[PDB]
Amino acid sequence: KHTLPDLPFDYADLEPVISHEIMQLHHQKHHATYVNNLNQIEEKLHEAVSKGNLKEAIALQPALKFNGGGHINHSIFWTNLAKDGGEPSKELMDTIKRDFGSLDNLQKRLSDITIAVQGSGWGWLGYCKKDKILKIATCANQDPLEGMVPLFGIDVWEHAYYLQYKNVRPDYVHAIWKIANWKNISERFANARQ
Amino acid sequence: MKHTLPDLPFDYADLEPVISHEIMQLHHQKHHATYVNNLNQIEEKLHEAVSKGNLKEAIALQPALKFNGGGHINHSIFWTNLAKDGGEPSKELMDTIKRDFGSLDNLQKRLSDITIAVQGSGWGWLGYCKKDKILKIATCANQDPLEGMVPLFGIDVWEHAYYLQYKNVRPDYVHAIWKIANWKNISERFANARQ
Amino acid sequence: MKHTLPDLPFDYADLEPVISHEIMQLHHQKHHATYVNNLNQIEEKLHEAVSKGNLKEAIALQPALKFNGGGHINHSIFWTNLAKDGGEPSKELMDTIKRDFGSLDNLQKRLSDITIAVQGSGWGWLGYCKKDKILKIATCANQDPLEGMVPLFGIDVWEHAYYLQYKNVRPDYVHAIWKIANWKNISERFANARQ
Amino acid sequence: KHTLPDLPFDYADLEPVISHEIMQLHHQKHHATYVNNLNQIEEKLHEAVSKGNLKEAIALQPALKFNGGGHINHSIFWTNLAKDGGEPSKELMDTIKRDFGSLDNLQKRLSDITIAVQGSGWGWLGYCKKDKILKIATCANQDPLEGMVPLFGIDVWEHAYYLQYKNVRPDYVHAIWKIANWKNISERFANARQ
Ligand SMILES: [Mn+2]
Ligand SMILES: [Mn+2]
Ligand SMILES: [Mn+2]
Ligand SMILES: [Mn+2]
């Protein structure tokens, strides 16, 4: 049932920040594999739940989280990147200033925790609806961001940057801000507020 | 269909003096019942999220399903694993115990030790690994079901399993539970696991 | 130097009827004492592994240090967080509670709810985040110390913290503990965290 | 104090299984960084333990495990690879046959669980001294193999194969057996038995 979404841009449009080969592999192989496996896992899960094998249904959870999370995360990620991303809306900039002091402080803080992820993971700018504040967080592997609405994600799995940056993850994390799609991020903010 | 609290295979006081009637009554009627009730609610929510294609919501419900589903699975096995007159391991289970642990005494020591060592709430398990065709021992956190092997005998070390009687002295409970291990059931589970 | 079990700032029966003298005596003299005794042993082993350059061994000891070290830290704070006559939040803490949670009633509800919801053994905490200069609530598993923020008030939901008195009814204990929250201490911790 | 060990071979000696660029980066950047950070963490830890900040000492644990584990794991890994690895000793082959049926079954089973690692991790062939049997296991991130003596490890962090294999982790896992250093593995087995 789930399908690989088309990117909102061509494979080379994020250069020089992220290469054509990376976009191509990342979308057509990595995200595709999460979608394919996700469809298969939902299948195994239904069989277990419909036949009453609660134990097997529990055993299938990590695979749903990993693949389901991979599909969720990458789907958001593509919308979060743009050749010409613009700037935050007035409402978002104001909120950024409120909760982080400045965009510069937010970028530094999110870059820092994202760079610090041990192993594979994601860094996120999110909106917490209960306390009505922007927050930053990281997630391991493909765990989706929970407890807050995702606004902007930074994939630090090595496949997100290795072909171009090799070991130098910090340069990729710092450079991704150049292609942050503030139009999309601001839209996600607006919707998270409503 | 809907999960139900299974009746115990004995009366609440049948395991004294190893486990008190008060413990047995709370443990079954309050703790296991709660897992069952919560499990039914969580399964309904999970079925809804799956049906609606709400992947994030389905994922968010997973800890609750594992906790309550695991609570149900674990306690259901645990009741069948206890008996005033449990008997002795079947010849084939005793022979396998000897083959894999040297003796029953060794198995009891090793499983008791790892079970006592559980940090916080959890369970100690004797299981059968079908791939390598061997008995193994393991512990699980919280209500995580034993996975990767077939459960044979479980020891609940959540403080509610023993506190009212044993207080802080978890080792006394773990050592004593062997006196009420239902070897008839454990042997049946073993025979079933080798099919 | 060697860790020691701190004396309670009150007598074992001083918190009745909210927490029984039996609970207080076991909790301090057996559970906390055990963390302290084990912590000293683990620190010695860890110091040895570090000195010898046994990296694998030092790493293997980490769960035991976190569990016992955390047990010590957590209980030490917990004793100071309880009082028969705790008083009321300082004006600055009350004002911050209002700023960050709307009211004290809201804070108590929100912290009680997440604390009640802890799966297995753990703790509920009111803390102060120094970076964002805000109060926050969180839970921790087992004896994991609250990290990333300064602990202000903790609620122990290990079953040994309440089972003898409350049995399975954890919510009654969590709601009731607010009646013995030592606001004098919590306020001092808050003032200290904003330095 | 800790230092980057020299490889027991030249950077291109594992070709065509693992490329010169991978060996170079993997050793001179990735393993080097674990060593450098490990030294720094031990420093922060000592200050915390010597000043009696138990809380800070606990906070430093993940960093010691990650960096300490990275140093342990990669140190073993280099010794586990060879252009001409030979074959298992008679004692090891016999033990492999005892606990897995055949070398083919062991390779399939270890390859399978290693391929299945979600995110970054390692696959291991180890020896359990208590039960006196070979076992296979996986570890997340840089967690060292615990509870058994390591004999042969397969690094499946994406940096271990991405430049050459890209997304195709299974081809790298299957191909690494060509360069398994059975001389070293058999020596580790012998020592684990004593
Ligand atoms: Mn990715
Ligand atoms: Mn129980
Ligand atoms: Mn306690
Ligand atoms: Mn590596």
Numbering used by the authors:
A (entry chain A), D (entry chain A): 1 to 194
B (entry chain C), C (entry chain C): 0 to 194
Q: Would you copy out the relevant sentences from the publication that reported this structure?
A:
MnSOD-2 and MnSOD-3 are homologous proteins and are both synthesized as precursors with N-terminal mitochondrial targeting signals. Here we present the structures of the two MnSODs which are strikingly similar to that from human. Gel-filtration chromatography indicated that the pure proteins were tetrameric, a result that was confirmed by analytical ultracentrifugation (results not shown). Similar to other reported MnSODs, the tetrameric quaternary structure in MnSOD-2 and MnSOD-3 is accomplished through interactions of the N-domain α-hairpin.
MnSOD-3 is associated with diapause and its expression is induced in the long-lived dauer stage. Dissection of the insulin/IGF signalling pathway has identified sod-3 as a significant target for the DAF-16/FOXO transcription factor. Inhibition of the insulin/IGF signalling pathway results in elevated expression of sod-3 and an extension in lifespan. A second MCAC purification yielded MnSOD-2 to 70% purity, while further ion exchange of MnSOD-3 using CM-52 gave a sample that was 98% pure. Specific activity was estimated for MnSOD-2 as 3622 ± 80 U mg−1 per manganese and for MnSOD-3 as 3261 ± 26 U mg−1 per manganese; the proteins were 60 and 100% metallated with mangan­ese, respectively. The C. elegans MnSODs are structurally similar to the human enzyme; superposition of all the Cα atoms of MnSOD-2 and MnSOD-3 with human SOD gives root-mean-square-deviations of 0.5 and 0.8 Å, respectively. One chain (chain C) in each SOD asymmetric unit was found to contain electron density corresponding to the N-terminal methionine residue. Two cis-prolines (Pro16) are present in each chain in common with other MnSODs.
